[PDB]
Coordinates of C-alpha atoms in Angstrom, one line a residue:
Chain A
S1263 CA -60.2 5.2 42.3
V1264 CA -59.0 8.8 42.8
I1265 CA -55.9 10.3 41.1
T1266 CA -53.1 11.9 43.2
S1267 CA -49.4 12.7 42.9
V1268 CA -46.2 10.9 43.6
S1269 CA -44.1 11.9 46.6
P1270 CA -40.8 10.8 47.9
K1271 CA -42.1 10.5 51.5
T1272 CA -45.4 8.6 50.7
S1273 CA -43.6 6.5 48.0
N1274 CA -40.0 6.6 46.9
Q1275 CA -40.6 8.2 43.5
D1276 CA -40.5 11.8 42.3
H1277 CA -41.0 13.7 39.0
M1278 CA -38.0 13.5 36.7
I1279 CA -36.9 16.7 35.1
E1280 CA -33.7 17.3 33.2
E1281 CA -32.2 20.0 31.1
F1282 CA -32.4 20.2 27.3
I1283 CA -29.1 20.9 25.5
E1284 CA -29.2 22.2 21.9
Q1285 CA -25.8 20.9 20.6
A1286 CA -26.5 17.3 21.8
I1287 CA -29.7 17.0 19.8
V1288 CA -30.4 14.0 17.5
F1289 CA -33.3 14.1 15.0
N1290 CA -35.5 11.1 14.3
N1291 CA -36.9 11.9 10.8
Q1292 CA -36.1 9.9 7.7
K1293 CA -36.3 11.4 4.2
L1294 CA -39.0 9.9 2.0
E1295 CA -36.9 10.0 -1.1
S1296 CA -33.3 10.8 -2.1
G1297 CA -31.2 11.5 -5.2
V1298 CA -34.1 12.3 -7.4
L1299 CA -35.5 15.5 -8.8
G1300 CA -37.7 17.5 -6.4
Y1301 CA -36.0 16.2 -3.3
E1302 CA -32.4 17.6 -3.3
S1303 CA -30.6 20.8 -3.5
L1304 CA -29.0 21.8 -6.8
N1305 CA -25.6 21.2 -5.3
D1306 CA -26.3 17.5 -4.7
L1307 CA -27.6 16.4 -8.1
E1308 CA -24.8 14.1 -9.4
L1309 CA -26.2 13.6 -13.0
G1310 CA -26.1 9.8 -12.9
Chain B
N838 CA -41.7 35.1 -23.5
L839 CA -42.9 34.8 -19.9
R840 CA -39.5 35.3 -18.1
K841 CA -36.3 37.2 -18.6
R842 CA -32.7 36.1 -17.9
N843 CA -32.7 37.8 -14.5
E844 CA -35.9 36.0 -13.5
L845 CA -34.8 32.5 -14.7
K846 CA -31.4 33.0 -13.0
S847 CA -33.3 33.4 -9.8
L848 CA -34.5 29.8 -9.6
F849 CA -31.1 28.0 -9.9
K850 CA -28.9 28.3 -6.8
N851 CA -26.7 26.0 -4.9
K852 CA -28.9 26.3 -1.8
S853 CA -32.1 25.9 -3.7
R854 CA -34.1 22.7 -4.2
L855 CA -35.3 22.3 -7.8
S856 CA -38.4 20.7 -9.4
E857 CA -40.4 20.0 -12.5
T858 CA -41.9 23.6 -12.6
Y859 CA -38.6 25.4 -13.0
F860 CA -37.9 23.4 -16.1
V861 CA -41.4 24.1 -17.5
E862 CA -40.6 27.8 -17.2
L863 CA -37.2 27.3 -18.7
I864 CA -38.6 25.4 -21.7
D865 CA -41.5 27.8 -22.3
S866 CA -39.3 30.9 -22.1
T867 CA -36.6 30.1 -24.7
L868 CA -36.9 29.7 -28.4
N869 CA -37.9 26.2 -29.7
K870 CA -36.6 26.0 -33.2
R871 CA -38.9 23.1 -34.1
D872 CA -42.2 24.5 -32.7
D873 CA -41.7 28.1 -33.7
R874 CA -40.3 27.3 -37.2
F875 CA -36.9 29.1 -37.2
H876 CA -33.6 27.3 -37.8
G877 CA -31.0 30.2 -38.3
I878 CA -28.4 29.5 -40.9
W879 CA -28.7 26.8 -43.6
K880 CA -26.6 23.6 -43.1
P881 CA -26.4 20.5 -45.2
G882 CA -27.2 17.2 -43.5
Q883 CA -30.4 18.4 -41.8
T884 CA -34.0 17.5 -42.3
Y885 CA -36.6 20.2 -42.8
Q886 CA -40.4 20.3 -42.7
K887 CA -43.0 22.4 -44.5
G888 CA -43.0 26.0 -43.2
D889 CA -39.4 26.2 -41.9
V890 CA -37.6 29.5 -42.2
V891 CA -33.8 29.6 -42.9
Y892 CA -31.3 32.4 -43.5
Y893 CA -29.1 32.0 -46.5
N894 CA -27.0 34.6 -48.2
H895 CA -28.7 38.0 -47.5
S896 CA -32.2 36.5 -47.6
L897 CA -34.7 34.5 -45.5
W898 CA -36.3 31.5 -47.2
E899 CA -39.4 29.5 -46.5
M900 CA -39.7 25.9 -47.6
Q901 CA -42.6 25.1 -49.9
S902 CA -42.5 21.3 -50.3
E903 CA -45.0 19.5 -48.0
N904 CA -42.9 16.4 -47.4
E905 CA -39.7 16.3 -45.4
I906 CA -36.5 16.8 -47.3
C907 CA -32.8 16.1 -46.6
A908 CA -30.7 19.2 -47.1
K909 CA -28.3 18.0 -49.9
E910 CA -24.8 19.4 -50.2
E911 CA -25.3 20.6 -53.8
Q912 CA -28.9 21.8 -53.4
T913 CA -28.9 25.2 -51.9
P914 CA -31.6 27.8 -51.3
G915 CA -31.8 29.5 -54.7
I916 CA -30.7 26.6 -56.8
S917 CA -33.5 24.2 -56.0
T918 CA -37.3 24.7 -56.2
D919 CA -38.1 23.8 -52.6
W920 CA -37.3 27.2 -51.1
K921 CA -38.7 30.6 -51.8
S922 CA -38.0 34.3 -50.9
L923 CA -39.4 37.7 -51.7
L924 CA -36.2 39.7 -51.4
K925 CA -35.2 38.0 -54.6
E926 CA -38.4 38.3 -56.6
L927 CA -38.7 42.0 -55.7
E928 CA -34.9 42.4 -56.4
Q929 CA -35.2 41.0 -59.9
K930 CA -38.4 43.0 -60.6
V931 CA -36.8 46.3 -59.5
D932 CA -33.7 45.4 -61.5
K933 CA -36.0 45.0 -64.6
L934 CA -37.6 48.4 -64.0
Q935 CA -34.2 49.9 -63.6
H936 CA -33.0 48.4 -66.9
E937 CA -36.1 49.5 -68.7

């Protein structure tokens, strides 16, 4: 085996490149804790 | 003793995330009337322990009795034999000298 590239005239596939847009970003990162001391801003402590 | 008002005020903001530490510095830096033995003005209904210091009329008083006591309405520093003060001993002694 020998590794080469993909071409639209030897196969029908190419490299797929698209543009990144800042305002359409979604994060995938969940907080480990919530609502407890040490993990929230002072504005968000509800004094339960 | 470790921090001033302008240093403690620097840890508590709306856009700041708090923690256990901030409260350690808050508790250490203010006056703990139990652990430093100072209660301000005498009030009936309290409980005191050996060594407490209290301000009653124009004098500071330290409690002598070794067991806890309940501050009774009609027992007041000067009447009872729990409390003590030097500004009264010296006052009476100098009054005696003045009279003599």
